[PDB]
Design a protein around this ligand. Structure first.
Ligand SMILES: O=c1[nH]c(=O)n([C@@H]2O[C@H](COP(=O)(O)O)[C@@H](O)[C@H]2O)c(=O)[nH]1
Ligand SMILES: O=c1[nH]c(=O)n([C@@H]2O[C@H](COP(=O)(O)O)[C@@H](O)[C@H]2O)c(=O)[nH]1
Ligand code: PRO
Ligand code: PRO
Lengths: 257, 257
């Protein structure tokens, strides 16, 4: 009954950003999102260029780049177009709608001008989505809602997660999916992206907890693994990305049957 | 039984940032925080200079400033020192500890270098605090935890709010208080700052809901009102700030008896 990524890309209610993502995931045999958690633009762009072919998405934290400029994002877009991946700015909007509108469009970062995807916490209520949508819908962007978190003590559980899902299913013109640790929506037009991923067991010293690609894609039913340190701390980041890609892709294939 | 701000500033377990804030609130007879939600540095600095004497705190969203530079924050610090108010960067950190550490210290904004106070959502678990504290404690900064929000559909209620309070009471070396709509902690060393404040009833079109200074300081027991549009959209921002200051200050005095 599970549809392939390529088939999900054609669903009637699919958002165009999700459809583009699903089509390139199927074409490239990748459901890996690189979390490019680096402070130097040159390293961001060298990673994007070398690992571009292995990834479906590159997740940025632009407010940790020491040398951010809009020109850096222009170069990143050139690579995303060349290698075919989407740019996800992991900004975690989490304010009232009137504020996030300006945070998304304006300031130094002009996030909406270069990010295909952004994410938002649902704790403020649906005004967070409505505010972002006022900017993002005209710019043909999409939003991910944070339905679960991977860190110890996360409060994004139970009824909070269910509120996130309902908020997404009510704003499907702009919300394309979730950050979660598992499948949280039964609707196949919604993407599920899962961080806290490493091939080995463990965590970090600040509350991160890791699960494997096979677990999060296979058993828990998510679509895309978001990997940072498991790739970016490795000596050979390209081979590491390929290891994560093959893991997440096989897990997806085995789930479909 | 309620202690004055000046007395709370001397409590044994008071954090130095809170003590400094409480002492200047008492000296200046102001418990008003200006939410300086503007896009131009010149307007930010003209507001800070003119309204400085009327406020205990200026809350920034630096990621909406079109013309942010570190020099703008240097000029803002000069005014905060001159007029005696604290600078609160309303960044709403809301990520895993390892990420927020870098978001706080680094990037273009170097928030920890100029903000006396920042705030954090508790949804990631206590790693968000631990990560920020790794930067902020050495820099003698403080953090506010978001225990409630003013916007329609807020999920920061019930057990979520109680988790925020517990997280604050367990990280009192760095957490100085809360963003909330009411008193949520019975411990007087913790500040309570309340946004969603206007003299008239109403809201905005993106989910903001307003309550009056008398209600939030008087009946609901909060310490400081955070006001944006009720001041910044008025023609005479100084007279508006004075109106809000007198409202919040009288409400506090009447509560003490
Ligand atoms: O629940 C969540 N957990 C999580 O780690 N992230 C983010 O995803 C990345 C994980 O990085 P690594 O731990 O793999 O090195 C970091 O950039 C976090 O900010 C996230 O967005 N949501
Ligand atoms: O619950 C919350 N509600 C809230 O409005 N704020 C913030 O406080 C300010 C309110 O602005 P006004 O509605 O008064 O013009 C804006 O800068 C919001 O981002 C906040 O931080 N928390
Ligand atoms: O991607 C493709 O080519 C096919 C078309 C139908 C679904 N998948
Ligand atoms: O601020 C003051 O001067 C007094 C001293 C004790 C408490 N308040």
């Amino acid at each position: 009954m599970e549809l392939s990524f390529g088939a999900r890309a054609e669903l009637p209610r699919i958002h165009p950003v999700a459809s583009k993502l699903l089509r390139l995931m199927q074409k490239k045999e990748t459901n890996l999102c690189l979390s490019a958690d680096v402070s130097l633009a040159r390293e961001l762009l060298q990673l994007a260029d070398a690992l571009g072919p292995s990834i479906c998405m590159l997740k940025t934290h632009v407010d940790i780049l020491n040398d951010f400029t809009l020109d850096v994002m222009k170069e990143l877009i050139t690579l995303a177009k060349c290698h075919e991946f989407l740019i996800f700015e992991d900004r975690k909007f989490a304010d009232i709608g009137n504020t996030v509108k300006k945070q998304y469009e304006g300031g130094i970062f002009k996030i909406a001008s270069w990010a295909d995807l952004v994410n938002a916490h649902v704790v403020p209520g649906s005004g967070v989505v409505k505010g972002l949508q006022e900017v993002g819908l005209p710019l043909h962007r999409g939003c991910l809602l944070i339905a679960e978190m991977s860190s110890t003590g996360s409060l994004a559980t139970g009824d909070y997660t269910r509120a996130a899902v309902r908020m997404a299913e009510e704003h499907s013109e702009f919300v394309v999916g979730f950050i979660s640790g598992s499948r949280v929506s039964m609707k196949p037009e919604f993407l599920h992206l899962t961080p806290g991923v490493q091939l080995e067991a463990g965590g970090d010293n600040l509350g991160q907890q890791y699960n494997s690609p096979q677990e999060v894609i296979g058993k828990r039913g998510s679509d895309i693994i978001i990997v940072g340190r498991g790739i970016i701390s490795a000596a050979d980041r390209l081979e590491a990305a390929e290891m994560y890609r093959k893991a997440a892709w096989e897990a997806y294939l085995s789930r479909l049957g």
